[PDB]
Amino acid sequence: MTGREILEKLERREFTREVLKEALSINDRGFNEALFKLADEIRRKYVGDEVHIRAIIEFSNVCRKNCLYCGLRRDNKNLKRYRMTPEEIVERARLAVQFGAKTIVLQSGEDPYXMPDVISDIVKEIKKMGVAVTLSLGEWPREYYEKWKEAGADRYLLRHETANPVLHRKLRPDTSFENRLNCLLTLKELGYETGAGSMVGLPGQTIDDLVDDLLFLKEHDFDMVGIGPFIPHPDTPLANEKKGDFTLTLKMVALTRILLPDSNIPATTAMGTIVPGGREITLRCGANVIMPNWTPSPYRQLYQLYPGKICVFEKDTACIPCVMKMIELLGRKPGRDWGGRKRVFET
Ligand SMILES: C[C@H](CCC(=O)NCCC[N+](C)(C)CCCS(=O)(=O)[O-])[C@H]1CC[C@H]2[C@@H]3[C@H](O)C[C@@H]4C[C@H](O)CC[C@]4(C)[C@H]3C[C@H](O)[C@]12C
Ligand SMILES: Nc1ncnc2c1ncn2[C@@H]1O[C@H](CSCC[C@H](N)C(=O)O)[C@@H](O)[C@H]1O
Ligand code: SF4
Numbered sequence: 399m400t401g402r403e404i405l406e407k408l409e410r411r412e413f414t415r416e417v418l419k420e421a422l423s424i425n426d427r428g429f430n431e432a433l434f435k436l437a438d439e440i441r442r443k444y445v446g447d448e449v450h451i452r453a454i455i456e457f458s459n460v461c462r463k464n465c466l467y468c469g470l471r472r473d474n475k476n477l478k479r480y481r482m483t484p485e486e487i488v489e490r491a492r493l494a495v496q497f498g499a500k501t502i503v504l505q506s507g508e509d510p511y512x513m514p515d516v517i518s519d520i521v522k523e524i525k526k527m528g529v530a531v532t533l534s535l536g537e538w539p540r541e542y543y544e545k546w547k548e549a550g551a552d553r554y555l556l557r558h559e560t561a562n563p564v565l566h567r568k569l570r571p572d573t574s575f576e577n578r579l580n581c582l583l584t585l586k587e588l589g590y591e592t593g594a595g596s597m598v599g600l601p602g603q604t605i606d607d608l609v610d611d612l613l614f615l616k617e618h619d620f621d622m623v624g625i626g627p628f629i630p631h632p633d634t635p636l637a638n639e640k641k642g643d644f645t646l647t648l649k650m651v652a653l654t655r656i657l658l659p660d661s662n663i664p665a666t667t668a669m670g671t672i673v674p675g676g677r678e679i680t681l682r683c684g685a686n687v688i689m690p691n692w693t694p695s696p697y698r699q700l701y702q703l704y705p706g707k708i709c710v711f712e713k714d715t716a717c718i719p720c721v722m723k724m725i726e727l728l729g730r731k732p733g734r735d736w737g738g739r740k741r742v743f744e745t
């Protein structure tokens with residue numbers, strides 16, 4: 399079909415595999431710009447002009463897993479490992495709340511040391527501050543997720559990475575797509591607001607794989623969807639592979655908004671790493687969330703999932719003010735509340 403025809407089907411919500419494949423395969427500038435406009439408009443209509451700020455503290459770069467794409471993979475000996483103390487994490491969260499953060503995201507490698515009880519203790523202390531707590535700690539037993547929910551955690555981010563089970567197992571040799579999905583289903587069952595999402599441009603990933611990622615997200619109706627380009631890391635087996643394409647990744651974000659109009663969708667730091675101003679573009683093509691880095695020195699520079707991260711040389715407290723300026727210059731507003739999902743039930 400022509401681009402005009404694909405757009406019309408998207409506007410009528412005929413979200414067929416064929417329509418999604420064609421949307422991702424067409425490279426016409428006019429088509430792409432119309433797609434981005436559509437996603438921007440849907441975002442405005444369903445989630446408004448508030449951009450929700452989630453302050454992220456990357457509190458440990460220790461990891462037991464060996465994901466082929468990730469700089470924190472256990473086989474990477476060329477990385478100084480660190481662990482923030484629970485007191486450091488709590489006080490760093492407190493500083494973020496003092497700076498106006500209404501959600502605190504705790505992210506780490508899969509570091510056994512903290513699991514589950516130290517995390518629970520930290521979550522309890524941060525919840526006293528009257529903010530939302532989101533965890534992004536990887537794959538753990540149901541019992542750990544249960545304990546963290548009881549401790550007061552609100553949300554959990556666990557990107558599905560790739561919905562192709564063969565590619566998933568190759569890239570993540572400690573685990574499987576089946577495991578990843580089971581974690582996500584468990585998190586939802588436990589009452590977390592649950593985030594999934596994927597990387598774009600992984601080695602061996604196809605356009606049909608991207609369509610499958612979109613259909614998977616639509617199937618499970620996730621509260622949050624985190625999408626970024628694959629960025630090769632020099633100290634990993636994928637060092638010499640091609641980076642994901644910014645425009646294709648942007649189309650995935652746009653299509654995600656169109657498919658899941660009331661979801662929360664970040665403009666990820668990976669988008670701003672591969673293209674200067676990439677986050678700002680992404681906030682205008684369907685995204686409505688930003689995650690300023692709140693990891694303190696000297697640890698921020700050591701949390702290297704991928705290289706070149708833009709947040710690294712800035713002062714400890716720079717990123718919250720930075721994103722507030724960003725939000726204003728985009729003609730948007732900061733979030734007024736915790737920015738939980740506001741479901742619009744439809745047909
Ligand atoms: C942390 C310190 C010391 C005082 C303190 O510990 N303050 C706790 C405030 C707690 N809250 C954020 C919940 C207040 C919300 C009030 S509000 O009226 O916005 O609803 C205070 C003193 C001045 C404050 C900055 C300025 O103001 C400018 C700017 C306003 C934005 O907006 C948020 C960002 C920013 C950079 C502010 C951050 C922070 O806050 C500062 C550094
Ligand atoms: N090289 C790379 N390029 C782009 N994104 C990457 C990347 N390496 C890792 N990521 C992304 O960073 C996200 C957080 S990894 C940290 C949280 C947890 N260990 C977990 O695995 O879920 C991953 O879900 C992945 O999508
Ligand atoms: S993606 Fe998460 S689990 Fe995999 S190596 Fe990186 S930090 Fe560890």
Ligand SMILES: [Cl-]
Nearest residue numbers: 452501532553
């Ligand atoms: Cl969140």
Ligand SMILES: [Cl-]
Nearest residue numbers: 624625664666
């Ligand atoms: Cl994310």
Ligand SMILES: [Cl-]
Nearest residue numbers: 626666667668
């Ligand atoms: Cl990212």
